[PDB]
């Protein structure tokens, strides 16, 4: 079983430096030349370059010349990936991905933010004025990512709840909305309910007419 | 730099229907010495690593399954699916690796329904919010498709720039429709300088653009 693993998602802030772990098993690693992909949120792969592993060398794509570096460890059976001056657009997944075959890494999600961990503010967003909508607002949290129900759960349908967002403060942002009957609202209690388990944090919110 | 050119970006399909993709390379990947074309294709589902389906322009790999063939030679490829299904909506990557590696621009699977109008909600910031000096306006163009929508953001008629950020549902499993959050970051001293925030929401499905709007205090 061949396989290669790499190590865990990445949270820096700009400036710094991050060094991502590709380990590789199951076959003589130094016969098999390692490629590095990046992707960033919602784009296309992009690759970055390729090293050596029995000589070390390293192969650079035009773009990926200054901030770069691959290396190995080679008794480990490893490949490393560092970028300095961690910038905004290095906000990615980056894949090693070996030569010959279908063999990739999981990927490492490396997110380039100014924030610290923090727990969400959840504001409501009332119901309006046979349907309406109503939902939540949790904002200004960090990192990804939060959970949120409805009712403890016995609200599933007509429920969107949108990917986050970075903020330019470095913040994660999102909505939570539902779609229920007008004729509903003043009889029906709607309470979303958000978690967010890196900083170990729980917030329900009432939501009801202004 | 072997170029890679891949076509459509973008295709929506129904349960059965057969779909190709067309890859360009700009120059041959064709090796003469061994008549190889160094030519592959990926699936890649939302998280999850690339795929191989097919290498050598032409071999499936060991577990794709059968409705996947790859065809073409020296600079024109097509990956073909026989028959779709919902196991098969994805994005597919070309990729050329002759010399070094080049990746196709991409192209993206979804389900084909009838067009829909987006139902557009308006929401005000809450009282509590205020009280920490920002105030979020939210808008909320739900179940439409297909995905195009532009969001017009207008604060007493005037037109914002640059001080908004969306966010869009994947497709839905279940009606094939997609959904849209608009999110409006004013100061609160702002937020109280204006009175009558607009949302203005373009889309294939409304006849004309629809407004959502509200007064401030009222």
């Known amino acids: 079983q061949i396989q290669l693993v790499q190590s865990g998602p990445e949270l820096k802030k700009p400036g710094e430096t991050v060094k991502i772990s590709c380990k590789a098993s199951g076959y003589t690693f130094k016969n098999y030349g390692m490629n590095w992909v990046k992707q960033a949120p919602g784009k296309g792969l992009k690759w970055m370059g390729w090293?050596?592993?029995?000589?070390?060398?390293?192969i650079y794509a035009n773009d990926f010349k200054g901030r770069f570096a691959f290396s190995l460890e080679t008794s480990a059976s490893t490949a490393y990936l560092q970028i300095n001056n961690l910038k905004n657009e290095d906000t990615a997944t980056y894949f090693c991905?070996?030569?010959?075959?279908?063999?990739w890494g999981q990927g490492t999600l490396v997110i380039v933010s100014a924030a610290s961990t923090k727990g969400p503010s959840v504001f409501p967003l009332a119901p309006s004025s046979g349907t309406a909508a109503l939902g939540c607002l949790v904002k200004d949290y960090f990192p990804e990512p939060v959970t949120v129900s409805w009712n403890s759960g016995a609200l599933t349908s007509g429920v969107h709840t949108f990917p986050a967002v970075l903020q330019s403060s470095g913040l994660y942002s999102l909505s939570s909305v539902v779609t229920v009957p007008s004729s509903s609202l003043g009889t029906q209690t709607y309470i979303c309910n958000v978690n967010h388990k890196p900083s170990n944090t729980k917030v329900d919110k009432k939501v009801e007419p202004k | 730099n072997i170029m890679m050119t891949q076509s459509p970006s973008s295709l929506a399909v129904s349960a059965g229907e057969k779909v190709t993709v067309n890859c360009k390379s700009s120059q041959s990947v064709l090796y003469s010495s061994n008549q190889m074309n160094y030519l592959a294709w990926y699936q890649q589902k939302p998280g999850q690593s690339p795929k191989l389906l097919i290498y050598?322009?032409?071999t499936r790999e060991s577990g794709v399954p059968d409705r996947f063939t790859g065809s073409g030679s020296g600079t024109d490829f097509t990956l073909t699916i026989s028959s779709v299904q919902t196991e098969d909506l994805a994005v597919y990557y070309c990729l050329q690796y002759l010399s070094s590696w080049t990746f196709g621009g991409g192209t993206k699977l979804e389900i084909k329904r009838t067009v829909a109008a987006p139902s557009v909600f308006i929401f005000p910031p809450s009282d509590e919010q205020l009280k920490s000096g920002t105030a979020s306006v939210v808008c909320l163009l739900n179940n439409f498709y297909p995905r195009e929508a532009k969001v017009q953001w207008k604060v007493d008629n005037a037109l914002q720039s640059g001080n908004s950020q969306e966010s869009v549902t994947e497709q839905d499993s279940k009606d094939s429709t997609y959904s849209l959050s608009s999110t409006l970051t004013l100061s609160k001293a702002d937020y109280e300088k204006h009175k009558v925030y607009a949302c203005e929401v373009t889309h294939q499905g409304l006849s004309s653009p629809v407004t959502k709007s509200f007064n401030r205090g009222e």
């Open positions: 050598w322009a032409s």
């Open positions: 991905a070996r030569d010959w075959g279908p063999y």
């Open positions: 090293i050596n592993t029995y000589t070390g060398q390293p």
